[PDB]
């Protein structure tokens, strides 16, 4: 109730549903896998982890560039693009 | 929470099949209604009475 | 899994 | 952009010249339902600007600079397949033989 | 790079170790951890 | 976490599957069916990973490793954060462009030798942090050269004080004194409290070393002393035996009392464990777990 | 080990589950 | 009207300890809702465009994103009275179905906390300052799928259901495009309208003189027919050789899902509580927005259905035979 | 003003259960902007009281340990719950009461049994199948986080300050995880 | 449990044990070309020993409204439902 | 219809509880002037003679320390989270005092 | 909080009871000295 | 590679589903129409006006 914080007393974040309940019950809880459902009601959490796995530096999201060179043909059409992705920022190419 | 038992079925099993007991029906138009697919009309033909 | 218990909320 | 050592590529950074040729056959971009003579009645696409649509993941800098200076390497050193793995003859056969 | 003489069957992976065994383990490592949201895996061929 | 960071370049750049390019001496081990381990695992691969593996271990490849020298010491700058950890991308970005521009035999050969004293030749950053002289004995050498020597009464205690006070700085690693404006400070921890104002205490210590005060003289001190000159005399406290200033001097009436201050409470935290453990085992208000527990103890 | 005989995903054989052995297809099982 | 409890066969010997393992307060059950939210609605009265609203400053402890969407007042019941006057109307109700069919017509989000700094969150997107869902004009382009949705929308809500478009875009999956979700619903679409300012010719007909099949249909109605066989005249032909010049005009479909803005870095489903909600400045001080929404003009009186989803766990257990217990939680915004 | 300072107290995260970076103790001053010498020299010497008190209670009960607000709590530093196993009195040992059915009778109803002369009852174990981690409650934050007495303050190289006062500061990031 | 059944494998030890472990061996080789995975029956036992009672419990039982109110509008049920000692209800039936 | 206000973190030590009440606009002075020339009323004021009349409209008071923690004390009234002044519609009977 | 609404604007008014004393005292003829004190809400 | 793509994305995606701003799709018969599954009218009844 007072010993835990409220993120611990509801598992909204902290512990996977079977290292908090008591072990009568994991030995219990998957020997009842098939007729006594029991995986509906104990809370896994996720997190969604911070600490240096998205930016920091204001990165532009995704931006759009406007062709240097193109030209006009009849037949074809050329251009040209310096993407220039600058220091940082990785592209995956497919998108 | 009367939305909330919505949303949730279809997001736990199907939900375009027609269970009765709980009357877990859907609410959905056909596709012909609020977008009228417009063909014309395949006609090509005189028939006669 | 065998047992492997869950919780999913709206926007998985 | 479905070819394939571009279709999936992971940039490390840098200024990439990226020439373009694109096509304003008329005649082979409109697919019909009749299989008629296009370019013969009149049709015409044409080209007011193009721009490249580029979206960028952020990943954060304790983690890219330990990503753009571990695929220098020749051996972290990406591969791609390609689909099918084409090649196409297209062997005649004239007049019902 | 600089032309590393190999094999033409080991330098494209047609025959060859896998993601798993020839990246660096700090990659395996970081292809490991971001494939629930950033995935690269498609990109380092799995051969048959 | 680690030691060494050329370790986390071998672990960086290298396959980590065994490949004859660069471990010949394993990936030869298991060709020829000699291993404790799983012994026949190579005839059972096909023809695919026999050829690609034993054509390549009976002549090896003849690789660079141009791109593996330079994340030794890559790695080994932002160990020792003379780069920041943003920027390693752009300096690897500007030194393999730089060896690659003015490369030659003496490069290639003068890089490995760079990267042999970030490994037994960094020994200096292991040891001075045991020694600490980052900033406790050197940074606190130039105080002891700024103190006057000639203290008219106690000229012996003053001299046993100071070797008392470089002890303190010396066996502890985090402690570290340093120059911020016109005088030095002394901070028994890095993130730490406990800040004592180390010119403005050993002032108020000079003409205060030789007092032979008596045992009924409690409350005079608020006009003489200064409470960081009293913390000063706390953070002395433990390093200080009863053979420095002995019991007749008014820092015998202090030091050696603080001595019995900190020992009231390394017993009585030992007794504050047993109080807090009880409140559980019996069933008591948590609440009211601590407010008569304190005041039996204070 | 029969590592001659899996189609290997490079080196590793492709060593398939453990149901993959036996069946208990009746009618309510 | 009664009550139908199944109950399972649990033997003696292993019920009893069922009873007493989950008597103790470590087993102790926890559950939530699954929507989540903080659901409160917003007038918008008679065709105004720019609706804002700033909530007073407080906590966002775990906050996971907002989610809107629009409905009218006359097809919505305030469910604070257990009896409604003044609600005459009967038909799949938006604010309790999942019906939802006015998420098209919509303008713009914008977002300042403390009325200080725009989020986006240190400018992701390509207009920063807001979010534009909806680009009538030309401009220079950021049009998706000819429609007018933009970029700027449809990376932070394509990639908030399906975690899907940093790497490429491709049909989502099978098993994520849910019924009340976006991707089987959104269906755009244009036509074009003869134009009007290129030429002389274009005098438009009112519906008691725009007709065709004449003759064959009744006038202005499904009455019997009456007329004259005769020459079409409404539809200006935009076909063959008569190539009467054309307008363009657009727009999209989204229905029956709400739009979502996730609360995060990347706009990524990373989690329950994403590293913004996580964050220490989020999570210990006081944080106003002035949040304020511009939607199409529409006639009848609507509401704007805002939903903060936050946290909504609740612990309960049954400490003895007879008694039960339950801690409720919602947070943030963890009142009534 | 650096000698008898005002102390830095906490502030509680009932979320995170962590310390909410400390702020300068602004609502217990007196005002003795209104007194001659007989008395700021005795509300000095009260100041000077809670911060000896302030630091003669941090001895007896708070955990040393380095990083003052840790964001991630170890295991055995916090306080775990160990009740007593719980008995579980079985009802009636089906060992031999499937044979009564078997005989013929059925049962109704419910030494403990007529039929049966022996009831065996079996204990378990109460407590979690681990510890806990990452956070501390309530209790554990009146214990612990005394209102920290800063002497001379603000005085030192930038990273040897007390980054954690500022209630922004990740104590793992060296940053304020802001606005993104 | 009765040896007419454990040597026809209708009940006890399953496949990947009584087939010899050079053929268990054997398949989990062999399932992208050749399965004979539908060919050696696996059992299942559904075990006794506190699964199903013994002792009389009603399955299914209805409750019951007691002091049923009404409003113009509303509608107020009031139940008692109660189970003992045993039967731990689910709730959500 | 409800104002929510905030405060921010700060030393409760020798605190003692809450009071409320309502007040006309023109009923107070600015406070921080000794002639405010937007008092133009002129009829006992409370904010100074200390006589209310305003305290009948009220519903629901929550007190809540840090967002989290409700302060009933742990759900210690029958709403776990708010101190229920009128309950006007129906639904219980929790409306004493007739 | 939460009120019932009228057409005037009506500025709310908490009283946060909070604690308040004084300590007035001469030590010689002349003079009076006073510290205050008001925890919480307080000045220094 | 044009055609490579084009049945990339069959492998991957699922294919019948459509998508509007790659514009992809699949152009598919229905086949009652290429494959006429004659049966003759819904007769039996004489249909006046």
Same mark, same amino acid.
Request: with cysteine.
């Given at each position: 109730?007072?010993?835990?914080?409220?993120?611990?007393?509801?598992?909204?974040?902290?512990?996977?549903?079977?290292?908090?309940?008591?072990?009568?019950?994991?030995?219990?809880?998957?020997?009842?896998?098939?007729?006594?459902?029991?995986?509906?009601?104990?809370?896994?959490?996720?997190?969604?982890?911070?600490?240096?796995?998205?930016?920091?530096?204001?990165?532009?999201?995704?931006?759009?560039?406007?062709?240097?060179?193109?030209?006009?043909?009849?037949?074809?059409?050329?251009?040209?693009?310096?993407?220039?992705?600058?220091?940082?920022?990785?592209?995956?190419?497919?998108? | 929470?009367?939305?909330?038992?919505?949303?949730?079925?279809?997001?736990?099993?199907?939900?375009?099949?027609?269970?009765?007991?709980?009357?877990?029906?859907?609410?959905?138009?056909?596709?012909?209604?609020?977008?009228?697919?417009?063909?014309?009309?395949?006609?090509?033909?005189?028939?006669?009475? | 899994?065998?047992?492997?218990?869950?919780?999913?909320?709206?926007?998985? | 952009?479905?070819?394939?050592?571009?279709?999936?590529?992971?940039?490390?950074?840098?200024?990439?010249?990226?020439?373009?040729?694109?096509?304003?056959?008329?005649?082979?971009?409109?697919?019909?339902?009749?299989?008629?003579?296009?370019?013969?009645?009149?049709?015409?696409?044409?080209?007011?600007?193009?721009?490249?649509?580029?979206?960028?993941?952020?990943?954060?800098?304790?983690?890219?600079?330990?990503?753009?200076?571990?695929?220098?390497?020749?051996?972290?050193?990406?591969?791609?397949?390609?689909?099918?793995?084409?090649?196409?003859?297209?062997?005649?056969?004239?007049?019902?033989? | !790079?600089?032309?590393?003489?190999? $094999?033409?069957?080991?330098?494209?992976?047609? =025959?060859?170790?896998? !993601?798993?065994?020839?990246?660096? $383990?700090?990659?395996?490592?970081?292809?490991? =951890?971001?494939?629930?949201?950033?995935?690269?895996?498609?990109?380092?061929?799995?051969?048959? | 976490?680690?030691?060494?960071?050329?370790?986390?370049?071998?672990?960086?750049?290298?396959?980590?599957?065994?490949?004859?390019?660069?471990?010949?001496?394993?990936?030869?081990?298991?060709?020829?069916?000699?291993?404790?381990?799983?012994?026949?695992?190579?005839?059972?691969?096909?023809?695919?990973?026999?050829?690609?593996?034993?054509?390549?271990?009976?002549?090896?490849?003849?690789?660079?490793?141009?791109?593996?020298?330079?994340?030794?010491?890559?790695?080994?700058?932002?160990?020792?954060?003379?780069?920041?950890?943003?920027?390693?991308?752009?300096?690897?970005?500007?030194?393999?462009?730089?060896?690659?521009?003015?490369?030659?035999?003496?490069?290639?050969?003068?890089?490995?030798?760079?990267?042999?004293?970030?490994?037994?030749?960094?020994?200096?950053?292991?040891?001075?942090?045991?020694?600490?002289?980052?900033?406790?004995?050197?940074?606190?050498?130039?105080?002891?050269?700024?103190?006057?020597?000639?203290?008219?009464?106690?000229?012996?205690?003053?001299?046993?004080?100071?070797?008392?006070?470089?002890?303190?700085?010396?066996?502890?690693?985090?402690?570290?004194?340093?120059?911020?404006?016109?005088?030095?400070?002394?901070?028994?921890?890095?993130?730490?409290?406990?800040?004592?104002?180390?010119?403005?205490?050993?002032?108020?210590?000079?003409?205060?070393?030789?007092?032979?005060?008596?045992?009924?003289?409690?409350?005079?001190?608020?006009?003489?002393?200064?409470?960081?000159?009293?913390?000063?005399?706390?953070?002395?406290?433990?390093?200080?035996?009863?053979?420095?200033?002995?019991?007749?001097?008014?820092?015998?009436?202090?030091?050696?009392?603080?001595?019995?201050?900190?020992?009231?409470?390394?017993?009585?935290?030992?007794?504050?464990?047993?109080?807090?453990?009880?409140?559980?085992?019996?069933?008591?208000?948590?609440?009211?777990?601590?407010?008569?527990?304190?005041?039996?103890?204070? | 080990?029969?590592?001659?005989?899996?189609?290997?995903?490079?080196?590793?054989?492709?060593?398939?589950?453990?149901?993959?052995?036996?069946?208990?297809?009746?009618?309510?099982? | 009207?009664?009550?139908?409890?199944?109950?399972?066969?649990?033997?003696?010997?292993?019920?009893?300890?069922?009873?007493?393992?989950?008597?103790?307060?470590?087993?102790?059950?926890?559950?939530?809702?699954?929507?989540?939210?903080?659901?409160?609605?917003?007038?918008?009265?008679?065709?105004?465009?720019?609706?804002?609203?700033?909530?007073?400053?407080?906590?966002?402890?775990?906050?996971?994103?907002?989610?809107?969407?629009?409905?009218?007042?006359?097809?919505?019941?305030?469910?604070?009275?257990?009896?409604?006057?003044?609600?005459?109307?009967?038909?799949?109700?938006?604010?309790?179905?999942?019906?939802?069919?006015?998420?098209?017509?919509?303008?713009?989000?914008?977002?300042?906390?403390?009325?200080?700094?725009?989020?986006?969150?240190?400018?992701?997107?390509?207009?920063?300052?807001?979010?534009?869902?909806?680009?009538?004009?030309?401009?220079?382009?950021?049009?998706?799928?000819?429609?007018?949705?933009?970029?700027?929308?449809?990376?932070?809500?394509?990639?908030?259901?399906?975690?899907?478009?940093?790497?490429?875009?491709?049909?989502?999956?099978?098993?994520?495009?849910?019924?009340?979700?976006?991707?089987?619903?959104?269906?755009?679409?244009?036509?074009?309208?003869?134009?009007?300012?290129?030429?002389?010719?274009?005098?438009?007909?009112?519906?008691?003189?725009?007709?065709?099949?004449?003759?064959?249909?009744?006038?202005?109605?499904?009455?019997?027919?009456?007329?004259?066989?005769?020459?079409?005249?409404?539809?200006?032909?935009?076909?063959?050789?008569?190539?009467?010049?054309?307008?363009?005009?657009?727009?999209?479909?989204?229905?029956?899902?709400?739009?979502?803005?996730?609360?995060?870095?990347?706009?990524?489903?990373?989690?329950?509580?994403?590293?913004?909600?996580?964050?220490?400045?989020?999570?210990?001080?006081?944080?106003?927005?002035?949040?304020?929404?511009?939607?199409?003009?529409?006639?009848?009186?609507?509401?704007?259905?805002?939903?903060?989803?936050?946290?909504?766990?609740?612990?309960?257990?049954?400490?003895?035979?007879?008694?039960?217990?339950?801690?409720?939680?919602?947070?943030?915004?963890?009142?009534? | 003003?650096?000698?008898?300072?005002?102390?830095?107290?906490?502030?509680?995260?009932?979320?995170?259960?962590?310390?909410?970076?400390?702020?300068?103790?602004?609502?217990?001053?007196?005002?003795?902007?209104?007194?001659?010498?007989?008395?700021?020299?005795?509300?000095?010497?009260?100041?000077?009281?809670?911060?000896?008190?302030?630091?003669?209670?941090?001895?007896?009960?708070?955990?040393?340990?380095?990083?003052?607000?840790?964001?991630?709590?170890?295991?055995?530093?916090?306080?775990?719950?160990?009740?007593?196993?719980?008995?579980?009195?079985?009802?009636?040992?089906?060992?031999?009461?499937?044979?009564?059915?078997?005989?013929?009778?059925?049962?109704?109803?419910?030494?403990?049994?007529?039929?049966?002369?022996?009831?065996?009852?079996?204990?378990?174990?109460?407590?979690?199948?681990?510890?806990?981690?990452?956070?501390?409650?309530?209790?554990?934050?009146?214990?612990?986080?005394?209102?920290?007495?800063?002497?001379?303050?603000?005085?030192?190289?930038?990273?040897?300050?007390?980054?954690?006062?500022?209630?922004?500061?990740?104590?793992?990031?060296?940053?304020?995880?802001?606005?993104?």
């Amino acid at each position: 109730p007072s010993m835990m914080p409220q993120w611990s007393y509801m598992h909204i974040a902290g512990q996977d549903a079977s290292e908090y309940l008591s072990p009568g019950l994991v030995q219990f809880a998957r020997a009842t896998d098939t007729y006594f459902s029991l995986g509906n009601k104990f809370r896994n959490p996720t997190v969604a982890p911070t600490h240096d796995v998205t930016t920091d530096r204001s990165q532009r999201l995704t931006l759009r560039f406007v062709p240097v060179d193109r030209e006009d043909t009849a037949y074809s059409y050329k251009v040209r693009f310096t993407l220039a992705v600058g220091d940082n920022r990785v592209l995956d190419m497919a998108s | 929470t009367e939305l909330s038992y919505q949303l949730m079925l279809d997001a736990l099993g199907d939900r375009s099949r027609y269970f009765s007991m709980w009357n877990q029906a859907v609410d959905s138009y056909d596709p012909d209604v609020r977008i009228i697919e417009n063909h014309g009309v395949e006609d090509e033909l005189p028939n006669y009475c | 899994g065998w047992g492997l218990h869950s919780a999913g909320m709206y926007g998985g | 952009q479905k070819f394939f050592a571009i279709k999936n590529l992971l940039l490390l950074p840098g200024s990439y010249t990226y020439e373009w040729n694109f096509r304003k056959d008329v005649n082979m971009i409109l697919q019909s339902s009749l299989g008629n003579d296009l370019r013969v009645d009149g049709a015409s696409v044409r080209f007011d600007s193009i721009n490249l649509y580029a979206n960028f993941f952020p990943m954060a800098h304790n983690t890219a600079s330990t990503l753009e200076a571990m695929l220098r390497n020749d051996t972290n050193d990406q591969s791609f397949n390609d689909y099918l793995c084409a090649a196409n003859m297209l062997y005649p056969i004239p007049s019902n033989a | !790079a600089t032309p590393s003489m190999m $094999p033409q069957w080991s330098y494209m992976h047609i =025959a060859g170790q896998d !993601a798993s065994e020839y990246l660096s $383990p700090g990659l395996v490592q970081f292809a490991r =951890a971001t494939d629930t949201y950033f995935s690269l895996g498609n990109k380092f061929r799995n051969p048959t | 976490q680690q030691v060494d960071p050329a370790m986390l370049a071998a672990l960086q750049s290298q396959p980590s599957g065994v490949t004859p390019s660069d471990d010949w001496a394993a990936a030869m081990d298991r060709i020829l069916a000699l291993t404790t381990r799983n012994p026949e695992a190579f005839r059972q691969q096909p023809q695919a990973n026999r050829f690609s593996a034993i054509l390549e271990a009976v002549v090896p490849s003849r690789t660079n490793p141009t791109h593996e020298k330079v994340l030794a010491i890559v790695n080994a700058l932002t160990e020792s954060k003379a780069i920041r950890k943003d920027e390693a991308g752009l300096i690897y970005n500007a030194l393999l462009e730089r060896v690659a521009r003015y490369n030659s035999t003496n490069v290639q050969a003068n890089l490995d030798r760079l990267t042999t004293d970030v490994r037994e030749a960094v020994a200096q950053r292991e040891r001075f942090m045991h020694d600490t002289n980052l900033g406790s004995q050197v940074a606190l050498n130039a105080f002891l050269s700024t103190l006057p020597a000639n203290v008219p009464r106690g000229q012996e205690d003053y001299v046993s004080f100071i070797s008392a006070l470089r002890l303190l700085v010396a066996e502890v690693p985090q402690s570290e004194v340093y120059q911020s404006g016109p005088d030095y400070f002394f901070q028994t921890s890095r993130q730490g409290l406990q800040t004592v104002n180390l010119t403005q205490a050993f002032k108020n210590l000079q003409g205060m070393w030789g007092v032979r005060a008596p045992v009924g003289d409690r409350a005079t001190i608020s006009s003489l002393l200064t409470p960081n000159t009293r913390l000063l005399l706390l953070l002395i406290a433990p390093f200080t035996n009863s053979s420095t200033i002995s019991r007749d001097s008014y820092l015998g009436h202090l030091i050696t009392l603080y001595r019995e201050a900190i020992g009231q409470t390394q017993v009585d935290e030992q007794t504050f464990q047993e109080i807090t453990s009880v409140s559980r085992a019996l069933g008591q208000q948590d609440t009211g777990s601590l407010e008569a527990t304190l005041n039996f103890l204070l | 080990n029969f590592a001659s005989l899996a189609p290997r995903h490079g080196s590793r054989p492709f060593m398939g589950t453990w149901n993959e052995i036996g069946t208990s297809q009746l009618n309510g099982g | 009207i009664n009550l139908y409890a199944n109950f399972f066969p649990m033997a003696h010997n292993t019920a009893s300890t069922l009873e007493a393992m989950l008597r103790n307060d470590t087993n102790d059950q926890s559950f939530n809702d699954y929507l989540c939210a903080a659901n409160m609605l917003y007038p918008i009265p008679s065709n105004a465009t720019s609706v804002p609203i700033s909530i007073p400053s407080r906590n966002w402890a775990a906050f996971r994103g907002w989610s809107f969407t629009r409905l009218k007042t006359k097809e919505t019941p305030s469910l604070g009275s257990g009896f409604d006057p003044y609600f005459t109307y009967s038909g799949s109700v938006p604010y309790l179905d999942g019906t939802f069919y006015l998420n098209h017509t919509f303008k713009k989000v914008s977002i300042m906390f403390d009325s200080s700094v725009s989020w986006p969150g240190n400018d992701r997107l390509l207009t920063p300052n807001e979010f534009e869902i909806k680009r009538t004009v030309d401009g220079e382009g950021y049009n998706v799928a000819q429609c007018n949705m933009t970029k700027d929308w449809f990376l932070i809500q394509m990639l908030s259901h399906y975690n899907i478009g940093y790497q490429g875009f491709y049909v989502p999956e099978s098993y994520k495009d849910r019924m009340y979700s976006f991707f089987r619903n959104f269906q755009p679409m244009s036509r074009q309208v003869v134009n009007t300012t290129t030429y002389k010719e274009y005098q438009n007909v009112t519906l008691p003189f725009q007709h065709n099949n004449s003759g064959f249909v009744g006038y202005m109605g499904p009455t019997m027919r009456e007329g004259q066989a005769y020459p079409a005249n409404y539809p200006y032909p935009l076909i063959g050789q008569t190539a009467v010049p054309s307008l363009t005009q657009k727009k999209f479909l989204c229905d029956r899902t709400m739009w979502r803005i996730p609360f995060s870095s990347n706009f990524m489903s990373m989690g329950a509580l994403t590293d913004l909600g996580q964050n220490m400045l989020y999570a210990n001080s006081a944080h106003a927005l002035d949040m304020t929404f511009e939607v199409d003009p529409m006639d009848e009186p609507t509401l704007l259905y805002v939903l903060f989803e936050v946290f909504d766990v609740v612990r309960i257990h049954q400490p003895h035979r007879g008694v039960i217990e339950a801690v409720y939680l919602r947070t943030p915004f963890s009142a009534g | 003003s650096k000698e008898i300072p005002t102390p830095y107290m906490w502030s509680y995260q009932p979320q995170m259960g962590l310390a909410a970076g400390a702020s300068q103790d602004y609502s217990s001053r007196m005002n003795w902007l209104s007194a001659g010498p007989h008395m700021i020299g005795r509300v000095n010497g009260i100041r000077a009281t809670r911060n000896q008190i302030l630091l003669e209670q941090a001895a007896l009960t708070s955990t040393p340990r380095s990083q003052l607000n840790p964001p991630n709590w170890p295991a055995v530093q916090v306080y775990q719950e160990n009740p007593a196993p719980t008995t579980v009195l079985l009802p009636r040992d089906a060992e031999a009461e499937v044979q009564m059915t078997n005989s013929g009778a059925q049962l109704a109803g419910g030494g403990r049994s007529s039929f049966t002369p022996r009831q065996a009852y079996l204990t378990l174990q109460s407590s979690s199948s681990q510890p806990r981690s990452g956070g501390i409650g309530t209790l554990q934050f009146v214990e612990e986080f005394v209102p920290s007495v800063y002497f001379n303050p603000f005085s030192g190289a930038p990273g040897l300050y007390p980054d954690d006062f500022i209630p922004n500061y990740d104590a793992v990031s060296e940053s304020v995880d802001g606005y993104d």
